[PDB]
Amino acid sequence: KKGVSSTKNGRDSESKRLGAKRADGQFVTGGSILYRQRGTKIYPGENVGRGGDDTLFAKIDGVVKFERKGRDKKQVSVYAVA
Amino acid sequence: ACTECGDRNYITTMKKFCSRENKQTLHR
Amino acid sequence: MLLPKRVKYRRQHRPKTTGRSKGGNYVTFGEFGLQATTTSWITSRQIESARIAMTRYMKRGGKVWIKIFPHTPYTKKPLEVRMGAGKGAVEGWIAVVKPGRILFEVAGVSEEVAREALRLASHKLPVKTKFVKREELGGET
RNA sequence: UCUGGUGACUAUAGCAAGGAGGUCACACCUGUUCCCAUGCCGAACACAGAAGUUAAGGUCUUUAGCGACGAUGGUAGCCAACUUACGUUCCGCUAGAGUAGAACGUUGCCAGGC
RNA sequence: GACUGGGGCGGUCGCCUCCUAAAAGGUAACGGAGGCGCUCAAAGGUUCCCUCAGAAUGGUUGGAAAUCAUUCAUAGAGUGUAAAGGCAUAAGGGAGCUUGACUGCGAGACCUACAAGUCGAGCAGGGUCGAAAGACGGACUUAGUGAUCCGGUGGUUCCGCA
RNA sequence: AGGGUAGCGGAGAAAUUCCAAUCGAACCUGGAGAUAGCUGGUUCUCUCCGAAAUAGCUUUAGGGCUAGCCUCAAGUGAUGAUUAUUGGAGGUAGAGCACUGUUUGGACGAGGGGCCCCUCGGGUACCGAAUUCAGACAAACUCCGAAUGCCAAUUAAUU
Ligand SMILES: [Mg+2]
Ligand SMILES: [Mg+2]
Ligand SMILES: [Mg+2]
Numbered sequence: 001k002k003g004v005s006s007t008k009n010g011r012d013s014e015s016k017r018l019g020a021k022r023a024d025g026q027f028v029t030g031g032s033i034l035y036r037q038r039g040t041k042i043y044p045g046e047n048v049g050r051g052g053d054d055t056l057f058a059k060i061d062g063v064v065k066f067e068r069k070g071r072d073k074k075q076v077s078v079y080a081v082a
Numbered sequence: 083a084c085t086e087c088g089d090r091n092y093i094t095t096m097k098k099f100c101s102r103e104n105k106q107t108l109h110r
Numbered sequence: 111m112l113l114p115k116r117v118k119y120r121r122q123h124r125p126k127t128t129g130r131s132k133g134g135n136y137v138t139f140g141e142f143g144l145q146a147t148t149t150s151w152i153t154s155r156q157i158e159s160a161r162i163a164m165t166r167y168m169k170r171g172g173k174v175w176i177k178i179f180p181h182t183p184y185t186k187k188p189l190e191v192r193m194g195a196g197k198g199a200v201e202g203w204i205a206v207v208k209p210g211r212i213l214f215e216v217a218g219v220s221e222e223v224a225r226e227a228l229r230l231a232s233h234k235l236p237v238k239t240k241f242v243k244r245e246e247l248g249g250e251t
Numbered sequence: 252u253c254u255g256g257u258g259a260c261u262a263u264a265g266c267a268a269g270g271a272g273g274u275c276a277c278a279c280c281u282g283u284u285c286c287c288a289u290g291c292c293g294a295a296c297a298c299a300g301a302a303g304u305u306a307a308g309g310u311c312u313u314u315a316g317c318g319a320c321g322a323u324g325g326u327a328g329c330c331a332a333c334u335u336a337c338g339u340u341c342c343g344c345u346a347g348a349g350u351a352g353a354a355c356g357u358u359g360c361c362a363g364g365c
Numbered sequence: 366g367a368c369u370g371g372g373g374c375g376g377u378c379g380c381c382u383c384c385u386a387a388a389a390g391g392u393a394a395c396g397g398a399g400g401c402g403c404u405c406a407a408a409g410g411u412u413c414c415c416u417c418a419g420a421a422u423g424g425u426u427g428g429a430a431a432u433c434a435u436u437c438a439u440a441g442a443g444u445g446u447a448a449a450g451g452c453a454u455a456a457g458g459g460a461g462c463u464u465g466a467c468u469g470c471g472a473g474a475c476c477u478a479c480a481a482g483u484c485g486a487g488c489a490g491g492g493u494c495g496a497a498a499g500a501c502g503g504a505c506u507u508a509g510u511g512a513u514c515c516g517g518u519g520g521u522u523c524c525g526c527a
Numbered sequence: 528a529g530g531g532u533a534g535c536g537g538a539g540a541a542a543u544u545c546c547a548a549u550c551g552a553a554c555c556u557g558g559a560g561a562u563a564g565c566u567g568g569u570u571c572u573c574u575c576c577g578a579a580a581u582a583g584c585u586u587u588a589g590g591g592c593u594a595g596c597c598u599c600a601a602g603u604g605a606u607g608a609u610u611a612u613u614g615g616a617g618g619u620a621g622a623g624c625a626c627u628g629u630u631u632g633g634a635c636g637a638g639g640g641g642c643c644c645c646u647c648g649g650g651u652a653c654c655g656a657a658u659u660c661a662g663a664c665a666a667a668c669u670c671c672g673a674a675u676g677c678c679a680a681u682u683a684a685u686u
């Protein structure tokens with residue numbers, strides 16, 4: 001009946017709000033984040049710096065562009081605003 | 083402690099800056 | 111009731127599957143085989159009973175297979191309870207059958223005795239059935 | 252476009268097998284006095300040499316046996332709409348995977364020898 | 366004391382990772398699986414160097430378990446720690462030297478009701494490694510935690526009831 | 528009959544019983560219009576606009592606060608919305624076995640266990656893994672991977 005007697009598993013509010021935070025064809029400012037992740041689900045290219053949680057940003061203004069490298073693993077690479 | 087003679091201790095259970103002579107020192 | 115066919119769990123609780131549709135899964139081993147056609151899924155107990163039948167009525171040995179195995183449990187919890195609390199204990203195992211699987215297959219016999227044993231099976235399962243000959247797949251490469 | 256060094260390209264480059272050549276490339280290679288170095292060891296790294304050789308590494312030729320690529324067609328599924336409560340059906344977008352066909356024994360840039 | 370498939374007994378009350386979660390995020394349940402309330406003076410930083418588990422066979426220690434020995438071995442190992450993500454130029458394993466586990470800051474972005482949290486190129490000071498470019502503001506990533514008031518210890522360009 | 532004990536009390540052969548028809552602590556006045564996160568009630572017409580029933584925290588869940596969602600007056604000034612076109616992040620449906628783990632029947636040889644022969648070996652049903660043929664299964668497996676949606680466009684039409 002009621003109560004008897006169990007777990008209570010369930011630790012259900014556990015959130016961090018990852019993902020992507022910009023898109024291709026998007027002007028962007030220095031210091032701005034593009035894409036949170038972990039490990040290297042995306043690598044950086046040019047005009048980029050990474051951080052102590054595998055975040056990504058742009059050291060300099062420009063225009064975001066993702067790319068392919070080796071049939072598995074991508075990379076992101078700002079290129080110069082004209 | 084320090085040999086700038088002022089308590090700075092990031093410890094719990096050494097040749098480095100201390101901001102009184104711009105040097106780096108023991109502490110300790 | 112009885113659950114002879116069993117395995118290492120890997121986990122004892124699982125969200126169910128409930129069937130929608132498919133075809134396919136032709137015969138590959140024997141000659142004659144049973145095709146499930148319609149609305150249900152299965153427990154092991156049933157399959158065992160069907161095997162008892164299909165082994166008796168065929169003397170002369172006569173070969174049988176079961177192309178499927180229940181990889182899935184079937185949970186059902188204490189008697190006369192209020193709902194709510196944690197998912198219940200194990201009672202059963204399951205082998206889902208969309209319309210198009212081929213449960214039972216045989217060879218070594220003629221066309222008749224097969225067909226009888228298969229009648230005597232399909233009365234002992236939920237699903238409507240159909241009798242089939244191995245003449246063709248829908249692909250041979 | 253012969254060789255070599257360095258770059259770019261989704262392994263169509265690869266992997267397995269076999270054939271051929273070297274004192275101009277490179278390599279094996281002789282040796283450890285010095286540079287230096289091996290947790291034992293000049294095997295490795297490194298320095299000094301060029302005695303012998305194409306065997307190996309590496310280069311070129313050919314192979315489609317392995318792996319990667321791979322359409323077109325039609326199928327499952329599904330966005331929208333009509334019926335319907337039917338483990339739904341009919342109609343209009345879209346369009347997989349698996350698979351056959353076929354493709355594949357790389358392609359180009361810069362320098363320097365030639 | 367609240368939840369509470371009436372209430373009670375039972376169980377839980379915060380945080381980290383997954384799945385349910387519907388190809389961005391977010392998204393509950395007395396739904397399903399696991400943990401944390403630390404550890405390190407090197408397991409940190411930096412310059413160099415190297416590549417494993419497994420398998421085959423011969424050999425003392427013979428579960429072929431111990432080190433050897435080559436060959437095959439596309440990462441099946443290992444990654445301080447729980448799981449997902451990640452890594453082979455290594456983020457793993459060893460050697461040298463050190464101790465950036467620094468000071469003052471911080472444009473600009475995420476997140477979110479708020480309070481809090483997260484990341485941060487770049488400037489200057491003054492230094493470690495390295496030949497030099499260059500790298501370093503803790504640990505591959507995330508959890509390892511506690512408002513304010515009050516009390517205490519040290520310091521000081523502060524005030525101090527004529 | 529005449530008298531006493533008076534409520535933070537008295538009396539009680541004790542039942543929480545009696546104390547001016549009332550007693551889990553009488554009665555009247557005053558504090559006092561006590562308090563109420565609760566129920567109930569709220570008075571004359573028209574016109575314009577127009578929701579929500581969620582997130583978080585809450586000795587909180589039928590209350591509250593902030594954000595959402597509305598209205599009004601200023602301000603901004605085409606920034607918003609739908610569609611088309613291009614690009615793009617993720618990994619569901621589906622499919623599949625290349626890792627994880629499950630599984631059936633073969634092939635099986637690497638080799639064993641006894642019962643038995645030998646007595647150094649033969650080992651004659653079951654098997655591990657060895658290697659493989661074919662066929663299957665999955666929210667917490669993925670070599671793969673749709674439709675939809677989501678993010679932006681010194682882009683275009685409508686509004
Ligand atoms: Mg009395
Ligand atoms: Mg009143
Ligand atoms: Mg409000």
Ligand SMILES: [Mg+2]
């Ligand atoms: Mg499925």
Ligand SMILES: [O]
Binds near residue numbers: 560
């Ligand atoms: O009142």
Ligand SMILES: [O]
Binds near residue numbers: 560
């Ligand atoms: O009142």
Ligand SMILES: [O]
């Ligand atoms: O009142």
